[PDB]
Each structure stands twice: as C-alpha cells, then as structure tokens.
C-alpha cells in the first residue's frame, strides 16, 4: 500500500485497457492491460492488482488479469464462471468476492470467490435477487 | 467479519436496499437514504460509506454513512462534482473517489475526504476524464 493505481475505463469514445500510477505530482502510465476493460472489478491481494470482468465495447468480459508490481507484467489467471460488468468486487481473508452484475442478458445474482492458491473460482452463494452496480463492504 | 451488499440495479428499479450476509443468509438492513446505482463504496474506520451513483434520473454527489452500531445511514459532507461509475478506495484514513460521469462530462477528478475534518478536496486530476475505472492501493 504506497501508490495509486487508475485501471481501465472510458473516456466517452474510446474504453481502456491502459493503467497509470500517481507518484514529482503527475500520473504516469505503467504496462497495460491485455484486454481492454471498463466497469471492471479492480482489487488488490497479495501485493497483485486484479481486474475482473468489465466491458469491452462489444461484449461482457468474464476473463481475470493480475498485474504483477515486480515483474510490471500483466497475465490471465483463471476466469470467471460468469461474464460481468458493473460488478462489485472485495477481498475477504485472502480471496476476491465478485458480487452480481450484469452478463450480457441477466442480471445476476450469483456470488464468486477466488482462491488464488488454487487458481479457482467457485460460487459462494447468492443474493436474494439479480442486480449490478452494487456497492460491496466488509465490515 | 460480515458481508455487505448496498444499492444496485436489479433490471428494472434502482434500489437504495442493503443486505448482510451472515447460518448462510442473506438478511436486509436498514436501507439507504437515497437510490444509488454504480456508487463508490468503501469501508473507513468501521462504517460503509456510499458516495455518488445514480438514482435512475440525475447523478449523486450525495454521501451517506452506515453505522453498524447505530444501524442508521448519515448524510457526511458532499462530493464537489456529481458521480456515477465511480472509482473508489480508502488509503490512511480517507477516501479517494477518481472520475465518474456527472451526466454531460467523463471526469478527470480525484476527490479526497478527511473524516475528522469532514471534507472533500480535489487532490489532482488524472490525464484524462475518464469513468468505469478500477482503483488500486498498493
């Protein structure tokens, strides 16, 4: 935990796979990603930016990416069960929460959790109803 | 140690509804003061924190605050600009909320929010307006 990571997004004409860090003030661009994401969820886990999911402009993404601070590479781990954008997404004890969503005709209400020591994902449970853009606190 | 679920869209309304997870069960809450969709959300100290989103007609620069203890959502200070699809984090004890739209412009503005002063101040600007961004602490 030092410095602040942008990822992802869109601009209102083009959506980004580009990702830059706030340090000397300015923000200055790092790797970018291997896909281009909006609406991603972007956590952090063993010192490892995650995205999951989000929006390309043409299709709902269920592939995951982590960005590796050391080596400042980017790679796939495994994907979702589930393509989502808008998701909300936490990390509780070790692994990343995915929470509902929106697949491309559904809005789910399915649950992921990804173990990263096993490289899985395997939905949890799920919420009392589909929905997407929801916020997500542990506490 | 609890799991909490606030607002969202379900399809058709969006709510302004919380959930906890606990005897695998999903249990309502005392719901938010204000329908937020796509809004930042974080955890500061121990209470949940909903700041922006969008209630179905006009962006939010409204923030309220959970308490657990009290179970009551509290309005705090507003965000200066409105935002949905907002980035958000917590880094030192206070919140950082990057971009978002506000319903004509893609923003490039990074907020800061003090809780002991109870304010908000723009920070810095990202290269670009940008929204959908994916906030990282580390």
Redesign the interface.
């Known amino acids: 935990?030092?410095?602040?990571?942008?990822?992802?997004?869109?601009?209102?004409t083009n959506?980004?796979n580009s990702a830059?860090c706030?340090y000397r003030?300015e923000?200055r661009?790092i790797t970018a990603m291997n896909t281009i994401?909006?609406?991603?969820?972007?956590?952090?886990l063993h010192?490892?930016?995650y995205?999951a999911g989000?929006?390309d402009g043409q299709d709902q993404l269920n592939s995951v990416e982590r960005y590796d601070?050391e080596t400042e590479t980017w790679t796939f781990v495994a994907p979702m069960k589930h393509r989502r954008s808008?998701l909300?997404i936490?990390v509780?004890q070790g692994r990343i929460?995915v929470?509902?969503g929106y697949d491309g005709h559904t809005?789910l209400d399915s649950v992921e959790c990804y173990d990263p020591d096993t490289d899985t994902w395997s939905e949890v449970?799920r919420?009392?109803?589909?929905?997407?853009?929801?916020?997500?606190?542990?506490?």
């Open positions: 935990h030092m410095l602040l990571y942008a990822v992802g997004g869109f601009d209102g959506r980004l830059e706030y003030n923000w661009m994401r909006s609406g991603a969820g972007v956590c952090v010192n490892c930016i995205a989000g929006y601070v808008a909300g936490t509780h929460y929470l509902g809005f449970t919420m009392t109803s589909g929905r997407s853009g929801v916020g997500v606190a542990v506490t």
